[PDB]
Amino acid sequence: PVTAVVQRVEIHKLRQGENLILGFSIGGGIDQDPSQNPFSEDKTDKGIYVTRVSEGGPAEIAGLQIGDKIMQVNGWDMTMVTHDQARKRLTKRSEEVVRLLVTRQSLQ
């Protein structure tokens, strides 16, 4: 049985003109083959995983870690979305602060 430990990470986007940046990369999504996930516990997990964190970027200072699984973003579930949907949820230009619920640990 799986019990995920979730914690929060608040990222403050960087606005370089018309260029909004979070400073991290995401992989996964229900439309992608999960057997290829390089972090996942269960190779059938189609969740959204953080694959990279940019040095000196907002995500780094916020505490996001490579390998973290994104469960939610500003209230929106991220457990069963397509890669594109995941991206759209994390790229709302009108939002400056993106609040995340992530898991980098299981219980036991």
Binding site: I21, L22, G23, F24, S25, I26, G27, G28, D31, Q32, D33, P34, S35, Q36, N37, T51, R52, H83, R87, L90, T91
Partner: peptide, 9 residues
């Protein structure tokens, strides 16, 4: 068919 891949944000 579609492989696992990542995108930068």
């Amino acid at each position: 068919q579609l492989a696992w891949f990542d995108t930068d944000l």
